[PDB]
Design a protein around this ligand. Structure first.
Ligand code: CLA
Ligand code: CLA
Ligand code: CLA
Ligand code: CLA
Ligand code: CLA
Ligand code: CLA
Ligand SMILES: CCCCCCCCCCCCCCCC(=O)OC[C@H](COP(=O)(O)OC[C@@H](O)CO)OC(=O)CCCCCCCCCCCCCCC
Ligand code: KC2
Ligand code: KC2
Ligand SMILES: CC1=C(/C=C/C(C)=C/C=C/C(C)=C/C=C/C=C(C)/C=C/C=C(C)/C=C/C2=C(C)CCCC2(C)C)C(C)(C)CCC1
Ligand SMILES: CC1=C(/C=C/C(C)=C/C=C/C(C)=C/C=C/C=C(C)/C=C/C=C(C)/C=C/C2=C(C)CCCC2(C)C)C(C)(C)CCC1
Ligand code: SF4
Ligand code: SF4
Lengths: 86, 49, 79, 253, 104
């Protein structure tokens, strides 16, 4: 699976969460920024690696980073449809 | 010869028996391996499923 | 507020990232395969789900998979 | 309808009564109140609110010309039968039934048949019905193939399949091989066919050793034992069929 | 069991075909049908030989037509005890005769 990390530069605009195609991310309460919320990545097992969160991130450099891990590819991260590894 | 009845005789026995055997195999498959339903005996291709 | 408890590291959250524990069925579905079922009156069905005693393919690769998670890494709560 | 102000006593010049009836029938009922901007009914509403009895009774020649240009004629709108046919088509497709057609030259013909496109599992794309695979004849044929036939031992399945495979395999080498013109063409082709049978049987043994299918296995038996038995007997049957074909060729020239 | 039943059917059949083959080996020497077996090639029964030589002699077309007829036939209790016993005897006789013809 890929690694989706969030950094404190986050401003809690929720655009990453809204752009998530498989609902990997969710906003959580925080005090670091004025919006009082920061995106989290609890369901990183479903991350496919499309980097749409990264596309939608406003900050100067991304407060959300998706690191691709081709060696640890799973069926959920590969979006397998015709074949099942479960 | 263009006349089909003459062409039958002009054809080799090899081809004639091959044709007869192929039609026999088709009939066997259609009547024993994949028999049509008793309600629609003419439904060879099984459309009524 | 997540009911899931991480098996490897209790301090961390569960890898699943879910908040509601799974619901077990009344009777788990048994292994099956889609085959024909001759109707005994000349009929025949195409995709009939019929029981299969064991794994359809007994390869170690196939049988090692339990479906608990991506790597079967979810705790007992996954089942 | 009477409740619509602009549809009341529309002058014949702006739009004929029959064409107006056809346009209303074609248009959805809910759109009569306030039709979308890009519709004939919208044009008719806009111009009937301005022209007609109790309003401007004259128009410039060019304005009237443009109005008649952009209003619809009778033959442009669909007929009752055409609308019924389209509605039936859409209803069939949404219900999951397909008015059967086969592609032809740069098109497709309608065979006049309605089939059940959706299978038992509605959301399963594997189960969509087709005559090729889900017809009675196809079901019976596939079920009666050696791989599938009921009441057959794995050795019987493999033997029959291999007989067929070797018997047809010897021929290509015999007829089109490098030594096709030599007196040993048939024997060399038999050797090549037996080699091909052996290679495919070795591949099948690899398949049964790696994936280990267990559909042919007896109860309480080692996994893939039935499949391996079937593959070994396929090798035997291929040898036998290749030899039989070679013998027939040699004996009958 | 299924194997015993299949083997019984196979034995009965091999016995019938063996009686038939023994009769077809015995009869031709005594007498042969007339009437130009293959008039196209000017072939006659007196000319055709009896035994394994017939396979080469008479045309592949004729052999294929015989095979097609057999294919049609196949595709479309003291008496039984005598049948099976005679089947055994005829199988022994036909295998012996064919082996002798091939060897010598
Ligand atoms: C005027 C000509 C005509 C018309 C209108 C029809 C109409 C029909 N035929 Mg067809 N049919 C025709 C000529 C015609 N046939 C000819 C010349 C043959 C001989 C090859 C057939 C052989 C045939 C069979 C065996 C069957 C039909 C069937 C049908 C019905 C379903 C369509 C189908 O699958 O056909 C198939 C027709 C083809 C030409 C395609 C053949 C494809 C295989 C693989 C070869 C339909 C009523 C089926 C039926 O009775 O369903 C109730 C059926 O089982 N037809
Ligand atoms: C753009 C290129 C193109 C061309 C050159 C054609 C040509 C043709 N189409 Mg059309 N067709 C096209 C695209 C095209 N099609 C596309 C994209 C579709 C898919 C929607 C269709 C769907 C379609 C259907 C459904 C039918 C045709 C048919 C025909 C034939 C009509 C004339 C006829 O039958 O005369 C001979 C009459 C005298 C002709 C061969 C008809 C036919 O018979 O096709 C086999 C027919 O019924 N076409
Ligand atoms: C695809 C193109 C093609 C074709 C048609 C041929 C054809 C031929 N090559 Mg080959 N050849 C090719 C590409 C091709 N070559 C290429 C790319 C190379 C360079 C690597 C060579 C190099 C080469 C050499 C060096 C030689 C040949 C030779 C031959 C001949 C014998 C081959 C043989 O033994 O086949 C064996 C055939 C089979 C095992 C059977 C496979 C095909 C069957 C018929 C498929 C049937 C499918 C069936 C319809 C499915 C029905 C299913 C269901 C509905 C029932 C033959 C004329 C030999 C020769 O002497 O030629 C005169 C020879 O020495 N070829
Ligand atoms: C590419 C060449 C090739 C290959 C890969 C094989 C492969 C095989 N042959 Mg061989 N074989 C070949 C050419 C080849 N053959 C040739 C040219 C001939 C002469 C006609 C034979 C005649 C032959 C016989 C008579 C037998 C084999 C058998 C076998 C099997 C041997 C291993 C075993 O016991 O498996 C177990 C399976 C295997 C499927 C045996 C077999 O089929 O065993 C079941 C067997 O009895 N082969
Ligand atoms: C019932 C089946 C059958 C029949 C009738 C024949 C008939 C023949 N085979 Mg044999 N053959 C068979 C099965 C059969 N084969 C099988 C299963 C294989 C695969 C292993 C072979 C492999 C084979 C080869 C490789 C050769 C023959 C040859 C021959 C000829 C002489 C055989 C002989 O008298 O050996 C007597 C001894 C025993 C003859 C055309 C030879 C021939 O003349 O080829 C042109 C030859 O070279 N056959
Ligand atoms: C295993 C079955 C079998 C086979 C393969 C043959 C094959 C042959 N028989 Mg026949 N034959 C058979 C059974 C068989 N016979 C039986 C049961 C009898 C009854 C006694 C005969 C009596 C018989 C005679 C008297 C003659 C033949 C002849 C022949 C040849 C010409 C075709 C013919 O007569 O068709 C089969 C005919 C039947 C009546 C059967 C051919 C080699 C003729 C021949 O060799 O002429 C060149 C010939 O003279 N057969
Ligand atoms: C004549 C030449 C023949 C040479 C063949 C040599 C292979 C012998 C194997 C005999 C197995 C005898 C036999 O019946 O064994 C069958 C055995 C069964 O194993 P399983 O555990 O899958 O069986 C399940 C049990 O229930 C039954 O035992 O499987 C294998 O042997 C696997 C074969 C894969 C081998 C992989 C290597 C492939 C070799 C390719 C060589 C081709 C060279 C040709 C040149 C072009
Ligand atoms: C009715 C359907 C039919 C089918 C399903 C079918 C299938 C096959 C197959 C595949 C299973 C093969 C491999 C095959 C091979 C040959 N066929 Mg054949 N064939 C059919 C029909 C005819 C007719 C009408 C003739 C004929 C012939 C030949 C010749 C020529 C040899 C030569 O001329 O030396 C060869 C090699 C001609 C013939 O026998 O000529 C003496 C001939 O007239 N076939 N044929
Ligand atoms: C017992 C099975 C059997 C059946 C059921 C059967 C049926 C029919 C039918 C029925 C629809 C017709 C119309 C027909 C026609 C011809 N048959 Mg045939 N026939 C059978 C057996 C043999 C044998 C053993 C030979 C043979 C032949 C010929 C010749 C060519 C003669 C020639 O050579 O001039 C022709 C025209 C000979 C042959 O092919 O010779 C090269 C040959 O030896 N047949 N045969
Ligand atoms: C049912 C059946 C069947 C079956 C079959 C099968 C199932 C098969 C398969 C088979 C297989 C499954 C095969 C395989 C093959 C293989 C191959 C072809 C391989 C190759 C390889 C490679 C190419 C590799 C390479 C390498 C090396 C060695 C080292 C390192 C590097 C590399 C990677 C390069 C048959 C027909 C018999 C008969 C009838 C019955
Ligand atoms: C679709 C189509 C088609 C197709 C066809 C086909 C595909 C066919 C096939 C064919 C084939 C593919 C055949 C085969 C056959 C085979 C055989 C006939 C075999 C036999 C064998 C034997 C007899 C053996 C024996 C043995 C053994 C097993 C072992 C030991 C030794 C011995 C020798 C005893 C056609 C063209 C018609 C046309 C129309 C359409
Ligand atoms: S990851 Fe980017 S888009 Fe999402 S809350 Fe943080 S700054 Fe906003
Ligand atoms: S890469 Fe795509 S799937 Fe993964 S967290 Fe980002 S938006 Fe979601």
């Amino acid at each position: 699976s890929h690694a989706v990390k969030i950094y404190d530069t986050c401003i809690g605009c929720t655009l990453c969460v809204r752009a998530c195609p498989t609902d990997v991310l969710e906003m959580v309460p925080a005090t670091v920024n004025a919006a009082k919320q920061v995106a989290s990545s609890p369901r990183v097992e479903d991350c496919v690696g499309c980097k749409r969160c990264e596309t939608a991130c406003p900050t100067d450099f991304l407060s959300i980073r998706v690191y691709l891990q081709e060696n640890e590819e799973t069926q959920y991260s590969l979006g397998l449809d015709l074949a099942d590894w479960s | 010869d263009n006349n089909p009845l003459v062409s039958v005789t002009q054809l080799p026995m090899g081809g004639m028996w091959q044709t007869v055997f192929f039609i026999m195999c088709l009939e066997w498959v259609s009547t024993y391996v994949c028999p049509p339903p008793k309600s629609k005996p003419w439904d060879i291709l099984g459309w009524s499923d | 507020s997540s009911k899931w408890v991480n098996p490897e590291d209790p301090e961390m959250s569960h890898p699943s990232g879910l908040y509601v524990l799974p619901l077990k069925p009344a009777k788990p579905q048994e292994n099956y395969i889609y085959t024909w079922k001759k109707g005994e009156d000349g009929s025949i069905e195409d995709y009939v789900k019929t029981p299969f005693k064991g794994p359809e393919r007994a390869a170690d690769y196939y049988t090692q998979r339990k479906g608990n998670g991506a790597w079967d890494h979810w705790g007992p709560q996954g089942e | 309808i009477s409740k619509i102000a602009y549809l009341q006593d529309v002058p014949r010049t702006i739009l004929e009564a029959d064409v107006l009836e056809k346009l209303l029938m074609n248009t959805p009922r809910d759109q009569w109140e306030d039709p979308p901007e890009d519709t004939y009914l919208y044009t008719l509403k806009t111009f009937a609110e301005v022209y007609g009895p109790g309003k401007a009774t004259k128009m410039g020649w060019w304005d009237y010309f443009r109005l008649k240009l952009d209003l619809p004629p009778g033959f442009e709108l669909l007929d009752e039968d055409e609308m019924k046919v389209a509605a039936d088509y859409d209803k069939l497709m949404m219900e999951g039934k397909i008015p059967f057609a086969v592609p032809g030259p740069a098109g497709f013909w309608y065979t006049g048949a309605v089939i059940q496109w959706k299978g038992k599992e509605q959301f399963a794309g594997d189960q969509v019905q087709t005559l090729t695979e889900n017809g009675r004849f196809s079901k019976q044929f596939l079920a009666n193939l050696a791989f599938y036939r009921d009441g057959l031992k794995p050795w019987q399945r493999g033997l029959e399949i291999g007989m067929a495979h070797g018997y047809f395999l010897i021929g290509p080498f015999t007829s089109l091989g490098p030594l096709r013109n030599t007196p040993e063409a048939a024997t060399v082709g038999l050797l090549c066919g037996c080699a091909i049978v052996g290679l495919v049987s070795i591949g099948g043994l690899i398949f049964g050793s790696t994936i280990k299918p267990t559909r042919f296995d007896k109860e309480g038996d080692k996994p893939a034992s039935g499949f391996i038995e079937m593959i070994n007997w396929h090798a035997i049957g291929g040898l036998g069929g290749a030899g039989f074909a070679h013998a027939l060729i040699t004996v009958f020239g | 069991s299924e194997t015993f039943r299949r083997r019984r059917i196979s034995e009965i059949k091999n016995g019938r075909v063996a009686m038939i083959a023994c009769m077809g080996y015995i009869a031709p020497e005594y007498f042969r049908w007339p009437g130009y077996c293959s008039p196209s090639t000017d072939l006659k029964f007196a000319d055709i030989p009896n035994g394994i030589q017939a396979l080469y002699k008479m045309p592949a077309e004729a052999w294929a037509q015989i095979g097609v007829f057999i294919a049609f036939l196949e595709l479309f209790r003291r008496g039984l005890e005598a049948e099976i016993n005679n089947g055994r005897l005829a199988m022994v006789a036909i295998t012996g005769m064919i082996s002798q013809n091939a060897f010598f």
